[PDB]
Ligand binder design. Structure first.
Ligand SMILES: [Cl-]
Length: 107
């Protein structure tokens, strides 16, 4: 019945439990990232996604995927190519795509 939330909740949990999710668990802090909030204008992280999900913001699959996609693209825009974050972004992205295909949110 409440099917979309349950599906989105399962995917976000899997993504947050993945061994490469750790750079993305919290908002980037100004202190640790020179000039992030000048270059990345729509920041996103998995804690904020968890909140939005709880707050019933994800009324469409499109809104959820756009937010999760933003986590990865923000990462790749800012971090160096062979940095551990960039490697994490693409591994987690690959896992994201695998799971949203398995749930038929893309098909
Ligand atoms: Cl609830």
């Amino acid at each position: 019945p409440d099917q979309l939330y349950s599906t989105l909740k399962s995917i976000l949990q899997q993504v947050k439990s993945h061994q490469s999710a750790w750079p993305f668990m919290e908002p980037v802090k100004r202190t640790e990232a020179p000039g992030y909030y000048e270059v990345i204008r729509f920041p996103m992280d998995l804690k904020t996604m968890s909140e939005r999900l709880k707050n019933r913001y994800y009324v469409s699959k499109k809104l959820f995927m756009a937010d999760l996609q933003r986590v990865f693209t923000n990462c790749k825009e800012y971090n160096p190519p062979e940095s551990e974050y960039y490697k994490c972004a693409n591994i987690l992205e690959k896992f994201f795509f695998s799971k949203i295909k398995e749930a038929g949110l893309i098909d």
